[PDB]
Design a binder for this molecule. Structure first.
Ligand SMILES: Cc1c2c(c(O)c3c(O)cccc13)C(=O)[C@]1(O)C(=O)C(C(N)=O)=C(O)[C@@H](N(C)C)[C@@H]1C2
Ligand SMILES: Cc1c2c(c(O)c3c(O)cccc13)C(=O)[C@]1(O)C(=O)C(C(N)=O)=C(O)[C@@H](N(C)C)[C@@H]1C2
Ligand SMILES: [Cl-]
Ligand SMILES: [Cl-]
Ligand SMILES: [Cl-]
Ligand SMILES: [Cl-]
Ligand SMILES: [Cl-]
Ligand SMILES: [Cl-]
Ligand SMILES: [Cl-]
Ligand SMILES: [Cl-]
Ligand SMILES: [K+]
Ligand SMILES: [K+]
Ligand SMILES: [K+]
Ligand SMILES: [K+]
Lengths: 195, 195
């Protein structure tokens, strides 16, 4: 079938849902695309290349809150950014695993640079803005991965497991996110005060 | 060689460092153990079983801050618990991936029940204590996974990438951890006040 970049990424994302990341293979991708393996090789060299592209494309297609709105607080940007990020990672099977360990792509530079600059414009040093952003990413990644991978007792554990059996992960994520954000705020506002 | 539980888990952990999680196979484990595959099968049924056991054993061997010290604050317990957890996950290649999506084992019940009970004894509802604990786990998991998987530019991104190129992940983890903990504290102390 058609083998332009968009079509290959389309088939690859469809395949990723069928197989998950560890099961996804260029052999299976070729079969999906109605092509022989050496044809596919011309377009996509190996699994790693493909995964790196899927990481970019999942966000490009689905992660829509990548920039603060006009006049938006840094707290509110991080919140919305995290929710958007989480929902994009959840859209494909093992999407958080696809994303892990990737560095911003060239096509993401202006976005990520704006995010970093925005934090500095709200009083964070670059370093502290980065650490806030990284913590949001890491928390959201851990929560998504745990959600996507979870797919006699003592009484509090029994209860806790009932609690987790009770939603998709959203409620715990949102509560934890608020805690994170408020902690950043306590840190920012402290300036050089002991806190 | 010897095929008791401890010896099999020993060889499996050694193998996990050589291969990583996706590359780890029962075929390769048998070879390591000097045995044929059907011998191994008697002891270890499949990769999943093995991984579930490695998740328990990595913590049992290396995660030493599993309980609060006498008189220890809940903030200080979470801090120490997170640092211990992080260091245990980092000890083996793909250790955080091994841990993902596991539920406490029977051999972990008393530990996890104590942790949950401790949070309730410091004023958290079970639910809110659980959410605090889960957020710590998820943040630490995301940070470890990103660290373990990371193994023209606009100027702030260039700087940020220099910043991350600069340590193992520890500094950003520790800074984010403080933020998390302080946010939980702000939430706990608020009681029913709008905050
Ligand atoms: C600033 C930054 C970010 C990311 C990132 O990997 C990263 C890095 O690896 C080194 C230095 C800086 C960054 C993100 O992955 C990313 O997910 C992302 O690319 C991103 C994006 N492209 O919109 C985000 O929304 C951000 N977020 C979830 C907080 C975060 C931003
Ligand atoms: C309370 C709890 C925990 C864990 C967990 O998976 C879990 C769950 O899956 C459902 C309900 C409750 C829990 C942990 O994995 C674990 O890593 C863990 O087993 C654990 C341990 N065994 O010592 C921890 O130290 C805890 N931590 C890193 C905050 C955390 C505790
Ligand atoms: Cl074509
Ligand atoms: Cl195209
Ligand atoms: Cl706002
Ligand atoms: Cl502020
Ligand atoms: Cl034996
Ligand atoms: Cl044994
Ligand atoms: Cl203390
Ligand atoms: Cl307190
Ligand atoms: K990334
Ligand atoms: K700067
Ligand atoms: K677990
Ligand atoms: K209870």
């Amino acid at each position: 079938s058609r083998l332009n970049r968009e079509s290959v990424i389309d088939a690859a994302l469809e395949l990723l849902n069928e197989t998950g990341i560890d099961g996804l293979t260029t052999r299976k991708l070729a079969q999906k695309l109605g092509i022989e393996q050496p044809t596919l090789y011309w377009h996509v060299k190996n699994k790693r290349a493909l995964l790196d592209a899927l990481a970019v494309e999942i966000l490009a297609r689905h992660h829509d809150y990548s920039l603060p709105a006009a006049g938006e607080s840094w707290q509110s940007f991080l919140r919305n950014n995290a929710m958007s990020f989480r929902r994009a990672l959840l859209r494909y099977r093992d999407g958080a695993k696809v994303h892990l360990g990737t560095r911003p792509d060239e096509k993401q530079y202006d976005t990520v640079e704006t995010q970093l600059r925005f934090m500095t414009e709200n009083g964070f040093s670059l370093r502290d803005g980065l650490y806030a952003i990284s913590a949001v990413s890491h928390f959201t990644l851990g929560a998504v991965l745990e959600q996507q991978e979870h797919t006699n007792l003592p009484p509090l554990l029994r209860e806790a497991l009932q609690i987790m059996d009770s939603d998709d992960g959203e409620q715990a994520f949102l509560h934890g996110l608020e805690s994170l954000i408020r902690g950043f705020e306590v840190q920012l506002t402290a300036l050089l005060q002991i806190v």
